[PDB]
Amino acid sequence: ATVGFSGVPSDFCRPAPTAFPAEPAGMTVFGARGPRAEGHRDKFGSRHAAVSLACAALLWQPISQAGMYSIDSGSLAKKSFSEMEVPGFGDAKKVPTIESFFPFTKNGFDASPALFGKDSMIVFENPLGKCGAYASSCHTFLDEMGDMLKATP
Amino acid sequence: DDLAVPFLERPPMLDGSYAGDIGFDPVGFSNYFDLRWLREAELKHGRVCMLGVVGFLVQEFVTLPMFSNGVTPVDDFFVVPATGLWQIFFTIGFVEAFSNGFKLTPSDMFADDRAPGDLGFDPLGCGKDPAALARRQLVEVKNGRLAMIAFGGMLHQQLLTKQGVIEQLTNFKAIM
Amino acid sequence: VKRGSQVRILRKESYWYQDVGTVATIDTSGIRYPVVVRFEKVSYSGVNTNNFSLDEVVEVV
Amino acid sequence: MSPSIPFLKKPDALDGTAAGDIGFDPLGFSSLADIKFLQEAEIKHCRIAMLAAAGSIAQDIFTFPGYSALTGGAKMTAAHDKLVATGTMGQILFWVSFAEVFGTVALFDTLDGKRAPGDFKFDPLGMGKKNMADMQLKEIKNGRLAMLGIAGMTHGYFISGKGPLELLGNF
Amino acid sequence: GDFLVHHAIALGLHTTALILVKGALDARGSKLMPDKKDFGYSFPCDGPGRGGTCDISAWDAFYLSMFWMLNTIG
Amino acid sequence: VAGLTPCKDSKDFQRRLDGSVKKLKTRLAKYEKGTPPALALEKQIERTQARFERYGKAGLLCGTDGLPHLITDGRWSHSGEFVIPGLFFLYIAGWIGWVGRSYVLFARESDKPTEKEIILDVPAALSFVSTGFIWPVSAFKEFTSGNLIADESEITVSPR
Amino acid sequence: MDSNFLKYLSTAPVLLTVWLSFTAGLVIEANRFFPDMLYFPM
Amino acid sequence: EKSASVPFLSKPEKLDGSMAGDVGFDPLGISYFIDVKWLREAELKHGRICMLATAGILVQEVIHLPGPAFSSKFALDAWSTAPRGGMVQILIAIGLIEMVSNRFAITATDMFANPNRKPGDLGFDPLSLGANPATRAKYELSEVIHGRAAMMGLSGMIHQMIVSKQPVIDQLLNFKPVDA
Amino acid sequence: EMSKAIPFAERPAKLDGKIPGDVGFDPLGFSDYYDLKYLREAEIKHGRICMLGALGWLFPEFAKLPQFASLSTNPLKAATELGPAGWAQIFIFVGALESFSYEKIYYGDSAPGDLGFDPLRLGKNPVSRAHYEVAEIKNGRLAMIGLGGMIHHSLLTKQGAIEQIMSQNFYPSGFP
Numbered sequence A: 001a002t003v004g005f006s007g008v009p010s011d012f013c014r015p016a017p018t019a020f021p022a023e024p025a026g027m028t029v030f031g032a033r034g035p036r037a038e039g040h041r042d043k044f045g046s047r048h049a050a051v052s053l054a055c056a057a058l059l060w061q062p063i064s065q066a067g068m069y070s071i072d073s074g075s076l077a078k079k080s081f082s083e084m085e086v087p088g089f090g091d092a093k094k095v096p097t098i099e100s101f102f103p104f105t106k107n108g109f110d111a112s113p114a115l116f117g118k119d120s121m122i123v124f125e126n127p128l129g130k131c132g133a134y135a136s137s138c139h140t141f142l143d144e145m146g147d148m149l150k151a152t153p
Numbered sequence B: 001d002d003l004a005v006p007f008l009e010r011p012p013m014l015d016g017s018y019a020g021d022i023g024f025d026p027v028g029f030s031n032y033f034d035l036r037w038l039r040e041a042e043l044k045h046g047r048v049c050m051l052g053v054v055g056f057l058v059q060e061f062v063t064l065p066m067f068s069n070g071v072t073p074v075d076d077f078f079v080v081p082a083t084g085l086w087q088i089f090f091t092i093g094f095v096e097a098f099s100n101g102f103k104l105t106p107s108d109m110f111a112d113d114r115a116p117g118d119l120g121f122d123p124l125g126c127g128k129d130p131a132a133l134a135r136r137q138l139v140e141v142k143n144g145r146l147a148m149i150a151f152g153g154m155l156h157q158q159l160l161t162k163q164g165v166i167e168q169l170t171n172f173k174a175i176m
Numbered sequence C: 001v002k003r004g005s006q007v008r009i010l011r012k013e014s015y016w017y018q019d020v021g022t023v024a025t026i027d028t029s030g031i032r033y034p035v036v037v038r039f040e041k042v043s044y045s046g047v048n049t050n051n052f053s054l055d056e057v058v059e060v061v
Numbered sequence D: 001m002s003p004s005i006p007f008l009k010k011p012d013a014l015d016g017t018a019a020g021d022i023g024f025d026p027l028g029f030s031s032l033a034d035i036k037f038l039q040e041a042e043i044k045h046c047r048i049a050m051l052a053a054a055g056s057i058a059q060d061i062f063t064f065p066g067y068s069a070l071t072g073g074a075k076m077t078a079a080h081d082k083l084v085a086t087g088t089m090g091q092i093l094f095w096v097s098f099a100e101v102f103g104t105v106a107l108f109d110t111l112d113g114k115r116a117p118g119d120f121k122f123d124p125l126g127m128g129k130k131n132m133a134d135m136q137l138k139e140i141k142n143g144r145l146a147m148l149g150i151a152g153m154t155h156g157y158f159i160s161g162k163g164p165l166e167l168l169g170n171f
Numbered sequence E: 001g002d003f004l005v006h007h008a009i010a011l012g013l014h015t016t017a018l019i020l021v022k023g024a025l026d027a028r029g030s031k032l033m034p035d036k037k038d039f040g041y042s043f044p045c046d047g048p049g050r051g052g053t054c055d056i057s058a059w060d061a062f063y064l065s066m067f068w069m070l071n072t073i074g
Numbered sequence F: 001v002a003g004l005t006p007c008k009d010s011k012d013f014q015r016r017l018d019g020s021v022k023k024l025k026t027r028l029a030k031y032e033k034g035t036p037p038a039l040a041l042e043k044q045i046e047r048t049q050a051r052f053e054r055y056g057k058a059g060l061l062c063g064t065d066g067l068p069h070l071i072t073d074g075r076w077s078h079s080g081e082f083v084i085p086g087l088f089f090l091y092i093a094g095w096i097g098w099v100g101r102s103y104v105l106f107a108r109e110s111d112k113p114t115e116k117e118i119i120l121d122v123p124a125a126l127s128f129v130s131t132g133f134i135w136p137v138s139a140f141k142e143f144t145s146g147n148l149i150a151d152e153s154e155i156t157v158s159p160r
Numbered sequence G: 001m002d003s004n005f006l007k008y009l010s011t012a013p014v015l016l017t018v019w020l021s022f023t024a025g026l027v028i029e030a031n032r033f034f035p036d037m038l039y040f041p042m
Numbered sequence H: 001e002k003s004a005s006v007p008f009l010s011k012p013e014k015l016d017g018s019m020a021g022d023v024g025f026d027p028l029g030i031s032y033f034i035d036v037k038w039l040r041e042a043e044l045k046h047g048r049i050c051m052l053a054t055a056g057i058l059v060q061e062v063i064h065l066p067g068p069a070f071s072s073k074f075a076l077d078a079w080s081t082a083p084r085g086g087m088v089q090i091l092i093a094i095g096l097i098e099m100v101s102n103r104f105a106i107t108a109t110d111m112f113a114n115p116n117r118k119p120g121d122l123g124f125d126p127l128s129l130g131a132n133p134a135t136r137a138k139y140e141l142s143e144v145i146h147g148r149a150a151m152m153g154l155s156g157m158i159h160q161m162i163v164s165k166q167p168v169i170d171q172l173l174n175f176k177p178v179d180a
Numbered sequence I: 001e002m003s004k005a006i007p008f009a010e011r012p013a014k015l016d017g018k019i020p021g022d023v024g025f026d027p028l029g030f031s032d033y034y035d036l037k038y039l040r041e042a043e044i045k046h047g048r049i050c051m052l053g054a055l056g057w058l059f060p061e062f063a064k065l066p067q068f069a070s071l072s073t074n075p076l077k078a079a080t081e082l083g084p085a086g087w088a089q090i091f092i093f094v095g096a097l098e099s100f101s102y103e104k105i106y107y108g109d110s111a112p113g114d115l116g117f118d119p120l121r122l123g124k125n126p127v128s129r130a131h132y133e134v135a136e137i138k139n140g141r142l143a144m145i146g147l148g149g150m151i152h153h154s155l156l157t158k159q160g161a162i163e164q165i166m167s168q169n170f171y172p173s174g175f176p
């Protein structure tokens, strides 16, 4: 007989390679273990991925709160970069800026150095409330089992 | 001899040949890109920023008769005619092309193996002396880095306070 | 061609024209159609064998 | 066996050479994770918690002028929220992240074995040249005590609304 | 309704053309009777050999299309 | 709107709904309340009303006959009428054909292909059935690798 | 189960009947829970 | 000769005990007709998805992302209330993940073409926790048992949510026995 | 043996990496079936078309010829507005250009995409020539992607690319 779902094309008369690549043992965090070109793990290894991610976060910190901040009025005021007008580009007085790449305000997301901000913050809702596993105001599963065992027909 | 970051190993590609090399490459850009290209970029940034700092200082006090004066040097740019700005841009492009000999890309910029930052510009012949050449290479790179940071600071603080650098220093107001 | 070889038929009137069969025997006596080809596909008449000449068969690779 | 837990066998990944190593790993997290990563994490937590505990106590004792005006007299995590709106926490986080980029580089040097865990070569006053092992044991012990202490202070604040010293004065 | 009857007409035209074109192109020979041009245009059949060869002529294709042409014009 | 009126606002569609509901209610009037026939007819009325309301909101266009008409020209406003339904078909049909062809080849390279075609090897058949979910890229891969299209000189043909 | 009985169940008509009954059930249940779908909803 | 899990039934022939979690449990004999490598890959994928599913159903009842769209303690209601574009994005991302992680070998005919490919091994070990031979077997057994437990738990959670119409924690705290 | 683009798959047989712009990316194997020189020429022509198209999708939003000032900044609306005569003249110009391509494809052999157009003699240096060939291929690819996106964005928003960016209606409301 045939055992189905072998995963081997030659068993099913399907095209396949003849020499399969060997599997090297190397890992990249935020990457995978598999065949790679020579020097790939050294040049773009876990160190590369992690340090690049750290740089990306440090650059996110300015980007998240991107905007022209001015104290000319006597208080710190934020104005979108889109407000600025640029000479020498004909009709387009107002030109794309970083907000084009990162439209936080359009979606109503209050970004911050850390991902979430005051207006847009993770919401923690307490599930327990005032309930108790037994002999509580809330009628729990254990309460149901106790009542059932003490019930009277 | 001393390393910029003692707890990190000296980067492999930084062997001290270039001026100002204190083994500072913690993120290892030299392991990805050609160090000649990186040093050319560093020197170009530093020179542009040295000129930019001197311009920030002069523009706040002295304005050319043909142009109008903005409140701050960053606003002088918006005040000045757009055609004039375009002319400056195209002149800079022509200068770059001619100085690099129409070898403007990483592929061919150093095809003749010219020293990074060496565009043959020495009208007064200041760098004829070798020892003076080395000392002035160190001075150039250090002053260029300091001017890079200083131009960033001047740009951002001028945009914030809406007052020139010296005007801000004379009338310093805390942001909050 | 030799015995036990795959040969493609080149006879237009043949049920197996441009199809591959296996040479079962080649008669050197000097008859008109010496080679004998077996086929897995049966013809309309129900025969899976035929006699062909050396010019009506080409060895396949 | 384990000096700390006599009835449990010494963890395999704990040789005992590291500062503060008393064979305390009943759950075997060292067998799961690289011990260099764990040592770096422990030293980091130790230093951050020491600064945090000293900061809670020192904020109870004294407050810088201007910061009181901006935070409206808020304390601990409420001061955190007020000064997030202020923008000061943003500066602290920016510069701490700038430090932590090179911290990541140093972490990978540790994992490559070139750097000892937690060794940033920062000793301007030269206090560790006499007995570095002794100082390291002191640092680890004080850091563990500070982690527990900052836990206690923060949860006491969550319970009562009062800082460490104010709580102790108004239990 | 016009759409549906139009596509019925398309079916009719295409099937009549199918029968007629097949008859014309296989008139000279097929794999069943590879020497049909020898027998001509309107021979009855080739016998019950080779599975049966009823209606193996191009005339038969005409005869079979005529049913379909009548259907389509209907 | 193309050449007709929206079905949500057509007196003909409303009249058809009314007629259907009235037929069902006349059939219901002769059955006691709560009996299986009454419940069945009530459910029929509810289904009719739901169908008509959903057709109205779907954005279907309706002619003077009061019946929805389909715009199968390519207009994206009416894609759900022919194109998306037809894409689902083409997906399923390519799946079926690809797995069937794969099984034909699998049986071809067997001891008894005819036995495999009358008495199937259902483990391998289910294998192919599973494979059929990426049939577009698989079929194009076969085409470009040359395993799909046979040469003109390797296919039997009748004499001219 | 007997391998001969399993081969019989693998015979073509049995498999065709079972597969088409399964498909008919699929269509019938789809129409039972989502009836009167003259269009893809968009 | 007899299975360990079901004593009266004979040991499944294809289950040789090499795989983690193997107690000879295959009463219906799927392994006879389906390759155990494919079956184990499927088992691990199901168990991993159900581990994540149980964790999500339990966690997103107490903590949510900001916004009315993401504010739903009931998981079946979250399925509908969460932004549909986001859900389609997740679907596309899962498809790309399947493709790349399986290295274009995503079918029953080619999945295990490479001898190096092992059932359930997609090259996922970002922190390299599985490089220790001593703990590797224990980790494998824990993963299989966790997948099984999470599969059962997720099925129970989904259907008890269908019945009660309340979250899992909310149901257990305010239990109301089924009435019609 | 292994593709550069996809490290876990074998290199396509026809794509050996020698030709410009080759990273071994052919997951569906077009190169095995179709003539590689024809494919390269088609890719180069598509890239040139889309480079000009992407430039002209945005240029009217910045400046318009005085004759076509009234025409919409939306490129599709401007296409509708132009009128048969101007479109006929553009078509004749394009066909005259494509007569040379017809001659080079059907009655000549040459490097793919080589129509003899190098008036400024920028391709004489071999190293710069290699960089420029790869740059043309890659900029063409990016322009193809960008212009397809731009066409679909203009379909949806019924506005120009810069106008869409400025108004931030990045997200669709459904089919048009």
Ligand code: CLA
Pocket: F082, F085, F086, F087, F089, F090, F093, F094, F096, F097, F098
């Ligand atoms: C509920 C609705 C319904 C039903 C019951 C059917 C039923 C049928 N359709 Mg289908 N069809 C439908 C909707 C429906 N269709 C719609 C909405 C469309 C528009 C997209 C089509 C388009 C369509 C086509 C294009 C074809 C059919 C065919 C068929 C018949 C055979 C299918 C077959 O053997 O599949 C099993 C699959 C195979 C045998 C594999 C080969 C054939 C498939 C269809 C190829 C699919 C992939 C291929 C690349 C598509 C290229 C199409 C292009 C050349 C136009 C069958 C009677 C076929 C027919 O009539 O042939 C004479 C056929 O070719 N249908």
Ligand code: KC2
Pocket: B081, B082, B083, B084, B085, B087, B088, B089, B091, B092
């Ligand atoms: C790198 C800097 C630079 C260089 C090397 C350079 C060289 C030359 C040369 C020789 C090669 C000529 C022949 C020339 C001629 C003119 N230049 Mg020019 N120029 C530069 C910079 C600026 C700026 C900033 C402005 C400007 C202008 C004008 C005007 C028109 C004035 C007017 O409009 O009255 C005329 C006639 C002004 C302008 O256009 O103002 C709208 C203006 O602001 N230029 N310029």
Ligand SMILES: CC1=C(C#C/C(C)=C/C=C/C(C)=C/C=C/C=C(C)/C=C/C=C(\C)C#CC2=C(C)C[C@@H](O)CC2(C)C)C(C)(C)C[C@H](O)C1
Pocket: D049, D050, D051, D053, D054, D122, D123, D124, D125, D126, D127, D142, D143, D145, D146, D148, D149, D150, D151, D152, D153, D156, D163, D164, D165, D167, D168
């Ligand atoms: C690196 C380096 C240097 C350095 C340095 C520096 C800056 C060193 C700084 C060291 C610091 C700040 C150490 C702080 C330790 C704090 C502890 C242990 C707190 C414990 C709290 C407890 C137990 C508590 C508590 C409590 C709880 C739980 C709840 C409360 O209700 C009650 C209570 C308060 C009792 C220098 C500059 C010298 C240079 C040198 O070359 C090297």
Ligand SMILES: CC1=C(C#C/C(C)=C/C=C/C(C)=C/C=C/C=C(C)/C=C/C=C(\C)C#CC2=C(C)C[C@@H](O)CC2(C)C)C(C)(C)C[C@H](O)C1
Pocket: H050, H051, H052, H054, H055, H124, H125, H126, H127, H128, H129, H130, H146, H147, H149, H150, H152, H153, H154, H155, H156, H157, H160, H168, H172
């Ligand atoms: C692999 C790997 C990694 C990893 C990882 C990760 C992310 C691992 C994550 C693992 C997770 C999330 C495991 C979750 C298991 C859940 C189970 C067993 C639930 C059982 C529920 C039951 C029995 C139930 C029930 C119930 C029901 C139905 C009825 C209710 O009335 C009661 C109740 C609620 C009790 C990392 C990223 C670290 C990298 C590393 O290099 C490699």
Ligand SMILES: CC1=C(C#C/C(C)=C/C=C/C(C)=C/C=C/C=C(C)/C=C/C=C(\C)C#CC2=C(C)C[C@@H](O)CC2(C)C)C(C)(C)C[C@H](O)C1
Pocket: I050, I051, I052, I054, I055, I117, I118, I119, I120, I121, I122, I139, I140, I142, I143, I145, I146, I147, I149, I150, I153, I161, I165
């Ligand atoms: C041959 C030759 C010559 C020459 C020449 C010439 C004239 C060469 C001209 C070359 C040109 C015009 C190249 C243009 C490339 C444009 C690209 C790549 C655009 C990409 C857009 C993207 C990615 C985008 C986008 C976007 C999308 C889609 C969505 C938006 O919301 C956002 C955004 C805008 C970002 C000369 C004449 C000198 C002679 C010489 O002897 C040699």
Ligand SMILES: CC1=CCCC(C)(C)[C@H]1/C=C/C(C)=C/C=C/C(C)=C/C=C/C=C(C)/C=C/C=C(C)/C=C/C1=C(C)CCCC1(C)C
Pocket: I076, I144, I145, I147, I148, I149, I151
């Ligand atoms: C004739 C006509 C009719 C109606 C409309 C209109 C009036 C405009 C007029 C003209 C229409 C025209 C010219 C339409 C042209 C459409 C175009 C150019 C569409 C372009 C589509 C491009 C697409 C998908 C590109 C997809 C790219 C993908 C996945 C890339 C993914 C990749 C990634 C992310 C990593 C590396 C691998 C790979 C695969 C490269």
Ligand SMILES: CCCCCCCCCCCCO[C@H]1O[C@H](CO)[C@@H](O[C@H]2O[C@H](CO)[C@@H](O)[C@H](O)[C@H]2O)[C@H](O)[C@H]1O
Pocket: A107, H084, H085, H086, I171, I172, I173
């Ligand atoms: C970053 C550049 C990447 C370029 C490649 C993008 C290619 C394909 C993009 C497709 C368009 C994005 O898809 C989008 O459509 C949905 C329509 O309901 C949007 O749905 C929602 O989007 C916005 C919030 O983000 C809201 O203002 C809209 O009112 C809402 O419709 C989602 O924003 C997203 O799912």
Ligand code: SF4
Pocket: E044, E045, E046, E047, E048, E052, E053, E054, E055
């Ligand atoms: S039945 Fe067909 S074959 Fe037999 S004789 Fe009559 S026509 Fe010829």
